[PDB]
Design a protein around this ligand. Structure first.
Ligand SMILES: CCOc1ccc2cc(-c3nn(C(C)C)c4ncnc(N)c34)ccc2c1
Length: 260
C-alpha cells in the first residue's frame, strides 16, 4: 500500500496531547515536511479498529478536511496528517485569540467547516461527532474537519441520541450547536444543564436562546439546524452559501460590538 512509510522517516518533536488511544505529536517527515503524528499505544486499544478511521481518511480528500499524509500500519502504529498550527478550534476559541475574534471571523470559520461537511454530504458519509473539539485551526484562520474515528449528548441530535438514527441531518444539528460554540467563544452549550436535563428539555421543545450580541439572523439559522424533524433541517450546501454570503445578503448593516 503506497501510504506506508518507513519508521526512520518520522521525527517526533513536540508532544501535543495524550488520550485513551495514544498520543499526538508535531514532527518532521523525510526531514523536510512539518507534520502531525498520532500513535496508538499497542496494549491500549484494538489495532484492527484503529486502522478503519485511517481507511476513511484514504478515501476522503478536500481542502477543509484534515489530510492524511502517511501511515505505519504495524504496531506500534503511527498516523501522519497535515500539521494544523493552532490546535483544536475549542482551545483556539477559549484561549488568548478568542478575545479578538469577532463575528466576521467566526462566520467565516463556520463557512469553512460547512464547506468540508458539504463535501462529506456529497460523498454520502456521516461524521457523527461534529463539534469545536473536532475541528482544527491553521494559519490565516483556516479551519478543517478532523477525527472520523466515529464516522456527547449536548451536540447530538435527539433522533441520534435516543434511537441511533445518525445521518447527515444529525450532523447539521451538531453544526447548529457548533455555531453556539463559535458565538460564545467556546462555552459548553446548555450552560448549567446536565445531560439528562438537556434531553428532556430538548424533546419538550427547548432550544438555546440567542447568544449575547449574536444577530437574530444567525440564531434563526441555529434554530433551522435544530428542527424536530431531520428532513426540514437545511443542507450543508445551503449552510455553506448562507454563511459565505452573510455580510452582504443577510446582515449588511452589521456593526462591531464589544465581543462579537
Ligand atoms: C485515524 C487517526 O487519524 C488522525 C491522525 C492525526 C490526527 C491529528 C490531530 C491533531 N490533533 N491536534 C491537537 C489538537 C492535539 C493537532 N494539532 C495539529 N495538527 C493536527 N493534525 C492535530 C487530530 C486528529 C488526528 C487523526
Amino acid at each position: 500500500d503506497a501510504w506506508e512509510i518507513p519508521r526512520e522517516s518520522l521525527r517526533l518533536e513536540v508532544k501535543l496531547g495524550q488520550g485513551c488511544f495514544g498520543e499526538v505529536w508535531m514532527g518532521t517527515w523525510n526531514g523536510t515536511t512539518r507534520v502531525a503524528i498520532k500513535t496508538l499505544k499497542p496494549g491500549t486499544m484494538s489495532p484492527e479498529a484503529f486502522l478503519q478511521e485511517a481507511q476513511v481518511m484514504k478515501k476522503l480528500r478536500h481542502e477543509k478536511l484534515v489530510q492524511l499524509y502517511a501511515v505505519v500500519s504495524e504496531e506500534p502504529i503511527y498516523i501522519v496528517t497535515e500539521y494544523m498550527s493552532k490546535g483544536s478550534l475549542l482551545d483556539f476559541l477559549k484561549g488568548e485569540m478568542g478575545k479578538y475574534l469577532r463575528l466576521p471571523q467566526l462566520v467565516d470559520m463556520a463557512a469553512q467547516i460547512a464547506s468540508g461537511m458539504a463535501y462529506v454530504e456529497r460523498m454520502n458519509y456521516v461524521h457523527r461527532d461534529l463539534r469545536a473539539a473536532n475541528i482544527l485551526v491553521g494559519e490565516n484562520l483556516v479551519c478543517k474537519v478532523a477525527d472520523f474515528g466515529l464516522a456527547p449528548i449536548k451536540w447530538t441530535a435527539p433522533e441520534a441520541a435516543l434511537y441511533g438514527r445518525f445521518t447527515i441531518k444529525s450532523d447539521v444539528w451538531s453544526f447548529g450547536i457548533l455555531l453556539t460554540e463559535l458565538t460564545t467563544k467556546g462555552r459548553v452549550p446548555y450552560p448549567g444543564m446536565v445531560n439528562r436535563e438537556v434531553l428532556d428539555q430538548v424533546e419538550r421543545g427547548y432550544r438555546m436562546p440567542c447568544p449575547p450580541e449574536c444577530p437574530e439572523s444567525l440564531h434563526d439559522l441555529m434554530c433551522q439546524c435544530w428542527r424536530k424533524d431531520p428532513e426540514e433541517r437545511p443542507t450543508f450546501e445551503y449552510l455553506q452559501a448562507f454563511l459565505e454570503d452573510y455580510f452582504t445578503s443577510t446582515e449588511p448593516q452589521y456593526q462591531p460590538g464589544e465581543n462579537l
